[PDB]
Amino acid sequence: QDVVDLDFFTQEPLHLVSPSFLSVTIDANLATDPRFLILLGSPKLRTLARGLSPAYLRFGGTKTDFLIFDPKKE
Amino acid sequence: KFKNSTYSRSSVDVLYTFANCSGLDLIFGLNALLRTADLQWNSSNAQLLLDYCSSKGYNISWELGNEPNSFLKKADIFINGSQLGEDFIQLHKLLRKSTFKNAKLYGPDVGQPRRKTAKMLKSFLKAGGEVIDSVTWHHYYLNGRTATREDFLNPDVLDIFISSVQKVFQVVESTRPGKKVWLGETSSAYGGGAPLLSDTFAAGFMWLDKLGLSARMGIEVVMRQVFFGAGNYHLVDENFDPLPDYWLSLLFKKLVGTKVLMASVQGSRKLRVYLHCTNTDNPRYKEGDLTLYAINLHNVTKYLRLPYPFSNKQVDKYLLRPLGPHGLLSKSVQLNGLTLKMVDDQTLPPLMEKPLRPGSSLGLPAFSYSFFVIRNAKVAACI
Ligand SMILES: CC(=O)N[C@@H]1[C@@H](O)[C@H](O)[C@@H](CO)O[C@H]1O
Ligand SMILES: *[C@@H]1O[C@H](CO)[C@@H](O)[C@H](O)[C@H]1NC(C)=O
Ligand SMILES: *[C@@H]1O[C@H](CO)[C@@H](O)[C@H](O)[C@H]1NC(C)=O
Ligand SMILES: *[C@@H]1O[C@H](CO)[C@@H](O)[C@H](O)[C@H]1NC(C)=O
Ligand SMILES: *[C@@H]1O[C@H](CO)[C@@H](O)[C@H](O)[C@H]1NC(C)=O
Ligand SMILES: O=C(O)[C@H]1CNCC(O)(O)[C@H]1O
Ligand SMILES: OC1[C@H](O)COC[C@H]1O
Ligand SMILES: [Cl-]
Ligand SMILES: [Cl-]
Ligand SMILES: [Cl-]
């Protein structure tokens, strides 16, 4: 047997990823939850988000193309 | 199935506040199915949002549309890739005349490259390639409705991702050489995730393997569907408790660096290994250290030996195993025998290494994954 040898190539980087390589999404459909404000307001959640910093947060999903901005909405 | 919905200046502010105060950079997807009389993008709504966001001083990157490939099926509207390129050109003009004239723009967020999606991506890039800073596509391995536990453990399932990636790069390199390529939205299985699978320890083989392959094959950025939400592929559950994949992600953030190297096993499928330079923001480690990570999908423990000149280096183990009794279907995970759980609502726990005897073999139990940091490795490429 169960003893395996590893070969390592270390002469140069083969690629460079973003410092943000591991990023996260919020589905756009989450904004149709009455409780959106509470959810993203959670300090507990923010703590968990802080841990993955630095990172992109992509707000998008199927619902992306079914959302209309309304600057008067309650 | 899907109908129009409006969203408020409040909602914008919640979303941006969440990103901003969490140290995250926000990408907002705009509605691409607002059309004109000649099937051209009607930009007036976005203009409203663009203006509002400038006034409030929000530093935001943009996307336009999501999976345009499924527009006909989901809205009875067909937009070809040419047109969509033109539409991205039109949005670019609007950004360059705004307060954030340098605002980043990414697209087109097409599904994984089957024959239909390849043509759309190619024509999209021939037309709009000029103005996108990154190419976004999405990937899922399986239908969450039908996906099995075996599927999640299966190396032949993991391997399909490889051809997906090759196909994206074949289109990109034939139309916009050197454009950065991002996974725009990705996870285990589609339709919200596989029930009792996508939120477990078992989900981590697909997540960590995706990361290793993506880095190795030249993907610059990977975006995990979803941080939080209704789908069981979420990193964090409805009680704001973190699932195994959150802890896997956090480990990866802290240990794994931006410079991607390569590792492989003499006699090459069920033992999968990745090698980067160690994250230099990690205070424990120093310039030139390596971070190995490894997945073991065999049913027995395996023992990995490091090559010269790394055989007698100090190694720090970071090994992940489910907290029983539900095994790989557990929603709880241990790091080197210690259960990982928030200290309080404001405080992530330390992630304690387990130092190994210098010169010792690297133990990797059946169905597990581990990081290993090779200290004082003095790899010139890492400095
Ligand atoms: C001891 C034994 O026979 N058990 C199974 C075996 O049937 C299988 O072929 C092998 C390789 O997958 O894995 C073992 O768990
Ligand atoms: C959403 O609104 C737009 C208005 O431009 C309309 O064209 C579209 O068909 C609507 N979608 C529906 C009715 O689901
Ligand atoms: C775009 O949509 C707006 C808002 O619904 C509408 O008033 C306007 O006439 C449309 N403009 C074009 C160019 O079709
Ligand atoms: C917005 O954020 C990026 C980093 O994510 C920064 O480099 C950029 O300069 C900011 N926008 C501007 C130009 O004000
Ligand atoms: C794409 O659609 C537009 C109209 O929306 C049409 O004018 C054009 O011919 C189509 N592109 C190609 C190359 O077929
Ligand atoms: O879980 C899925 O099937 C996803 C497909 N892509 C868009 C989305 O992230 O909204 C999800 O619907
Ligand atoms: O346990 C054996 C070893 O892990 C090699 O794969 C097949 C198994 O039978
Ligand atoms: Cl896809
Ligand atoms: Cl097309
Ligand atoms: Cl959601």
Number of H helices, E strands in chain A: 2, 5
Interatomic CA distance for residues B55 and B24, integer angstroms: 20
Give, as one character, the DSSP assignment of residue B202: G
Q: Measured between alpha carbons, how far is A57 from A37 in angstroms, rounded to an integer?
A: 17
Q: Nearest-CA neighbor of A69 among B87, B93, B12?
A: B12
Query: Of the residues B63, B67, B150, B173, which is catalytic?
Result: B67
Exp. method? X-ray
Buried b (16+ CB within 10 A) or exposed e, A11-49: eebbbebbebbbbbbbbbbbbeeeebeebbebebbbbbb
Identify which of B3, B31, B221 has the shortest CB distance to residue A56: B221
- Please state, in angstroms and rounded to a whole number, the distance separating the CA atoms of residues B69 and B383: 44
Which residues of chain B are within 8 Å of residue A34 when distances are taken between CB atoms? none
Contact assessment for residue B41 and residue B87, using Cβ atoms and an 8 Å cutoff: yes
Query: What b/e string do you get for B335-360 counting C-beta neighbours within 10 Å, with b at 16 or more?
Result: beeeebebeeeeebeebebeebeeee
Which of B127, B210, B214 lies closest to B166, judged by CA?
B214
Residue B4 Cβ contacting ligand 2 at under 6 Å: yes
Single out the residue of B30, B134, B123 nearest to residue B80, CA to CA: B123
Q: Which of A16, A44, A68 sits opposite B240 (nearest CB)?
A: A44
Question: Ligand 3 centre and the CA of B41: distance in Å?
Answer: 10
How large is the greatest C-alpha to C-alpha distance in chain B, in angstroms?
72
CA–CA dist B336, B357 (Å, integer): 15
Contact assignment for A7 to B65 by CB distance below 8 Å: no
Is B185 annotated as catalytic?
yes
Let me know: does A25 contact B192? Beta carbons within 8 Å: no
Closest residue CA from atom 2 of ligand 4: B59
CB atoms within 10 A of CB B177: 7
Backbone angles phi, psi at B284, to 5 degrees: -70, -30
Cα separation values, B226 from B15, B43, B193, B266, Å:
15, 28, 10, 36
Q: Which helix (H) or strand (E) holds A49?
A: helix A43-51
Q: What span, in angstroms and rounded, lies between the C-alpha atoms of B191 and B146? A: 10
B5 lines ligand 2 (CB under 6 A): no
Ligand 6 pocket (Cβ < 6 Å) reads A 27, 61-62; B 67, 138, 185, 190-192, 225, 231
Cis preceding-peptide flag for B244 (omega within 30 of 0): no
Nearest-angstrom CA–CA distance, A8 and B307: 7
Burial of B318 (0-12, 13-18, 19+ CB in 10 A): buried
B300 ligand 7 Cβ < 6 A: yes
Could you give the strand order of the β-sheet that contains B262-265, starting from the edge strand earlier in sequence?
A: B262-265, A3-9, B302-305, B362-364
State which residues form the domain around B97.
9-260
Q: Contacts from B44-49 at CB under 8 Å and sequence distance 24+?
A: B45/A68, B45/A69, B46/A69, B46/B91, B46/B94, B47/B94, B48/A69, B48/A71, B49/A69, B49/B12
Residues sharing a CB contact under 8 Å with residue B14, sequence separation 6 or more, in sequence order? A36, A37, A40, A41
Q: How far is CA B320 from CA A31, A68, B301, B323, B370, in A?
A: 34, 43, 14, 10, 6
How far is B383 from B364, CA to CA, in rounded Å? Answer: 29
CA distance B30 to B34: 10
Q: How far apart are CA B361 and CA B305, in angstroms?
A: 5
What whole-number distance in Å separates Cα of residue B340 and Cα of residue B327?
15
The answer to whether the beta carbons of residues A60 and B226 sit under 8 Å apart is no
Query: Among B209, B247, B211, which Cα is nearest to B330's?
Result: B247
Nearest-Cα residue of chain A relative to residue B360: A3
CATH assignment of the domain containing B144: 3.20.20.80
> What residues in B contact A10, CB-CB < 8 Å?
261, 275, 290, 379, 381
If you take atom 14 of ligand 5, which residue's CA is the nearest one?
A: B80
C-alpha span between B368 and B305 (Å, rounded): 17
Substitution target in B18, B49, B246, B370 with the highest count of A β-carbons within 10 Å is B18
Catalytic status, residue B173: no
| B115-128 helix and B155-173 helix, angle to the nearest 10 degrees | 30
Sequence-separated (6 or more) residues with CB below 8 Å from residue B113: B121, B137, B164, B167, B168, B171
Alpha helices by DSSP H, listed for chain B, are 9-21, 44-56, 71-75, 81-96, 115-128, 149-153, 155-173, 204-217, 244-255
Residue B111 is classified by DSSP as P
Residues 6+ apart with CB under 8 A from B233: B144, B187, B188, B189, B192, B193, B198, B199, B203, B225, B226
DSSP 8-class letter at B367 = S
DSSP codes of every residue in B43-68: -HHHHHHHHHHHHHT--EEEEE-S-G
Delimit the domains of chain A by residue range: 1-74
How many Å apart are CA B211 and CA B181, to the nearest integer?
A: 14
Tokens of B181: 């390529």
* Parallel/antiparallel/unpaired status of strands B338-339 and A15-16: unpaired
Question: How many helices and strands, by DSSP H and E, does chain B display?
Answer: 9, 18
Q: Which of B8, B250, B306 sits opposite A74 (nearest CB)?
A: B8
- Active-site residue (options: B63, B150, B173, B185): B185
Cβ-count burial B106-120 (b if 16+ within 10 Å, e if not): bbbbbbbbeeebbeb
